[PDB]
Amino acid sequence: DVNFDLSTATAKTYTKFIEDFRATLPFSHKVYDIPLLYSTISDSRRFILLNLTSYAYETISVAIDVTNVYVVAYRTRDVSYFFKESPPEAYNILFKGTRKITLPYTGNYENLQTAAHKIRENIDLGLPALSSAITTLFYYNAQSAPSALLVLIQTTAEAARFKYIERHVAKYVATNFKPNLAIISLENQWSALSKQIFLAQNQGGKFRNPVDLIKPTGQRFQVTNVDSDVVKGNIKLLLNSRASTADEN
Numbered sequence: 001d002v003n004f005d006l007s008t009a010t011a012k013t014y015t016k017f018i019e020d021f022r023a024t025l026p027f028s029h030k031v032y033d034i035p036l037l038y039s040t041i042s043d044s045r046r047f048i049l050l051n052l053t054s055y056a057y058e059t060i061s062v063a064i065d066v067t068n069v070y071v072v073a074y075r076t077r078d079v080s081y082f083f084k085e086s087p088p089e090a091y092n093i094l095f096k097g098t099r100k101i102t103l104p105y106t107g108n109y110e111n112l113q114t115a116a117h118k119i120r121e122n123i124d125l126g127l128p129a130l131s132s133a134i135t136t137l138f139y140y141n142a143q144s145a146p147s148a149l150l151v152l153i154q155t156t157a158e159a160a161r162f163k164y165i166e167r168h169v170a171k172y173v174a175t176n177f178k179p180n181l182a183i184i185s186l187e188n189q190w191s192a193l194s195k196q197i198f199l200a201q202n203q204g205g206k207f208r209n210p211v212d213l214i215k216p217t218g219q220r221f222q223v224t225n226v227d228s229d230v231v232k233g234n235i236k237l238l239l240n241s242r243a244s245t246a247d248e249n
């Protein structure tokens, strides 16, 4: 699986974890050089596992849906906790033999957020903060869980979607930070960005609809071409065509 052990980790081993994780994902072909992810995949290949150990050697294994980089479930020791409203497949092929519990919330930011009474703009990301969520996830408790899960997906799934986010957490290695407004907006927008870069093949570069983002400082701008600085060296994983278009952005 894609390994990352916090007990040996530096800004270097963290980018390599992300770099490796970006490259066990199957994609069908690079759209504007951003790998585009399969809408449909033989369930044998559906899920990839990330192998996360903390400073103090708590190993949890978390499952990623390659079809959309979502985290679907996670195993601690030999209990295995699934999001409410997972893939059915996930339940069959994954963590066989473990008592399998279904967390009371779906895995999406606005649920997670509720269960946590705490929007992620108030939750310290960072490499120390990762290695803590792993401790509060290993030793599961329904109070602790949901905010620990907020930390886990942003420092891994969104890091692999957006190099802006990968870079930020590579910066904070012996300290934590907070989502700046730009990291949030990339987060809330990977999908509309995927839908429009997909469309923007047909009209030779330009978006069909514009995508609205916010600078760290609070300045609302918009990107509207695959030329723009966000598309151009930032985005690294494209949302599967079916998922990205069903929703109007």
Ligand SMILES: *[C@@H]1O[C@H](CO)[C@@H](O[C@@H]2O[C@H](CO)[C@@H](O[C@@H]3O[C@H](CO[C@H]4O[C@H](CO)[C@@H](O)[C@H](O)[C@@H]4O)[C@@H](O)[C@H](O)[C@@H]3O[C@@H]3OC[C@@H](O)[C@H](O)[C@H]3O)[C@H](O)[C@H]2NC(C)=O)[C@H](O[C@H]2O[C@@H](C)[C@H](O)[C@H](O)[C@H]2O)[C@H]1NC(C)=O
Pocket (backbone or CB within 6 Å): 001, 003, 005, 008, 051, 052, 053, 057, 058, 059
């Ligand atoms: C999921 O991720 C886990 C975390 O990395 C993997 O488990 C760990 O695997 C590593 C290496 O792959 C392994 O590390 C060794 O730890 C030992 C240190 O402890 C001993 O120290 C002295 C030595 O004489 C003894 O006197 C003490 O009493 C301790 O017992 C030692 O064998 C090695 O030196 C390794 O550590 C070094 O660390 C610094 C690096 O620079 C070096 O490259 C490296 O050699 C641990 O067993 C384990 N760690 C923890 C905290 O859990 C896991 O894969 C493993 O699974 C086990 C079954 C297998 O035997 C291997 O260890 C490895 O495959 C990984 N994969 C999966 C599928 O979950």
